[PDB]
Amino acid sequence: ISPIETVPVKLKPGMDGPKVKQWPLTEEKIKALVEICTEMEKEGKISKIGPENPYNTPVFAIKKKDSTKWRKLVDFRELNKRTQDFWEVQLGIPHPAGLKKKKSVTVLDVGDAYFSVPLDEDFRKYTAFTIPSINNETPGIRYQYNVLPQGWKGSPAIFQSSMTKILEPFKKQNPDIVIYQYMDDLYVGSDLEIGQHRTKIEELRQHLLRWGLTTPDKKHQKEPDSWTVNDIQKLVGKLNWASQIYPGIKVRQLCKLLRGTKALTEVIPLTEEAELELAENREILKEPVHGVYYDPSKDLIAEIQKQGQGQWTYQIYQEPFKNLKTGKYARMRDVKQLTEAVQKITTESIVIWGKTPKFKLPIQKETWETWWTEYWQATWIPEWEFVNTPPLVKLWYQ
């Protein structure tokens, strides 16, 4: 028996519950989903069947780590827009601008807590959803959540008081270690404690279990000559173009070099306004030279990952040719490659900005909807968009 012990969750003026879809899951994928949900229903509260409420929320069944069992990854993306973004004002868990500065960060899936511990009242009806049936032969019936849904940002907003007190005994015994709760996950980060963090983390993975049942099941240790003419079609062309994400900085007296015609001959290699501009530009290209590049916690963080070969270059920027961070993930031998990058980026946007970015993926809309859910482990869901036909590299890098 709990019994009564809620928190008044509500939606922004002029809103209704999501009425999304549910992607037609592979059968085996539903078979499990159907299992995860039955134990959940008998595991009480966590779920109970609905029948006269329209709201629905995408639901996927997946596995995580080296895999053995499965797990539901429920896509509360519109309920967020619909509740959290609104109920993002107070309840809100603010973001520590040092978590990155604290160079070593282990993250713990402390989210199981959200379950039976606390709950929804009067609003359970919006966390509805459905588990399918191959070819819709049966009206694959729908459940309703009766506890905090391990998914929406609306939960930790609710669970920050319980979570705060629980983490209190540690925040002192082990003073300033920056702990950041984001959404079912904790970025306990710390200074380069000589490989150590292995310790304190398991220390906390344990403190959680002692002083509560909050469980980050396992230590979770994510512990971190020929200067051909054509060569200038290249050199210039991109050079001319790099400085665009810059002011009108010189390239031209290096430029003009190719006058007249004749493209397989070498130009110079050795000149004033050439070497003393190739280089002049050369020294100009180093990350920190920037300018009025600023985050405006008010304009969405757009991102554009560019497929490189075995490698993949990515670029998080807030508004046009003004990147706020532009690095490259890369693992040789690919849809399941983007998969690993789109995650790497968000898990990094977070540590850095308390919010995931909106992805512009170089993939066919639907070759993703079919298996992003293959090697997709993380519990949050970056909001993506399929931007194709196409990007422009042939440099950008070197």
CB 154 within 8 A of CB 195: no
Smaller CB separation from other proteins, 79 or 110: 79
Task: Scan residues 180-199 and list those touching other proteins (CB under 8 A).
Answer: none
Closest of 7, 14, 5, 20 to residue 126, by C-alpha: 20
CA distances, 31 to each of 83, 96, 262 (Å): 30, 41, 67
Binding of other proteins by 398 (CB under 8 A): no
Helix 229-242 vs helix 275-284: angle between axes, to the nearest 10 degrees? 40
* Residue 122, marked binder: no
Cis peptide before 24 (omega within 30 of 0): no
CA angle 230, 235, 240 (to 5 degrees): 125
DSSP states of 89-153 as a string?
Answer: SSS-----TTTTTS--EEEE-TTGGGTTSS--SS-GGGG-EE---GGGSS---EEE--S--SS-T
Closest CB 108 distance from other proteins, rounded Å: 31
Q: Which of 136, 247, 286, 298 contacts other proteins by CB under 8 A?
A: 136
Binding of other proteins by 371 (CB under 8 A): yes
Binding of other proteins by 263 (CB under 8 A): yes
Buried/exposed code over 164-174 (b: 16+ C-beta within 10 A; e: otherwise): eebbeebeeeb
Smaller CB separation from other proteins, 56 or 349: 56
Smaller CB separation from other proteins, 27 or 176: 27
Binding of other proteins by 122 (CB under 8 A): no
Task: Give me the 13-32 binding string for other proteins, x by CB under 8 A, dash otherwise.
Answer: ---x--x----xxxxx-x--
Number of residues this chain uses to bind other proteins (CB under 8 A)? 60
Binding of other proteins by 332 (CB under 8 A): no
Q: Which of 4, 42, 94, 261 contacts other proteins by CB under 8 A?
A: 261
Whole-angstrom distance, CA of residue 166 vs CA of residue 211: 7
Annotated binding site: 109, 184-185
Annotated binding site for Mg(2+): 109, 184-185
Q: Which residues of the shown chain bind other proteins in the complex (CB under 8 A)?
A: 16, 19, 24-28, 30, 51-54, 56, 134-139, 142, 228-230, 232-233, 236-237, 240-241, 252, 255-264, 307, 334-338, 361-364, 366-367, 370-371, 388, 390-394
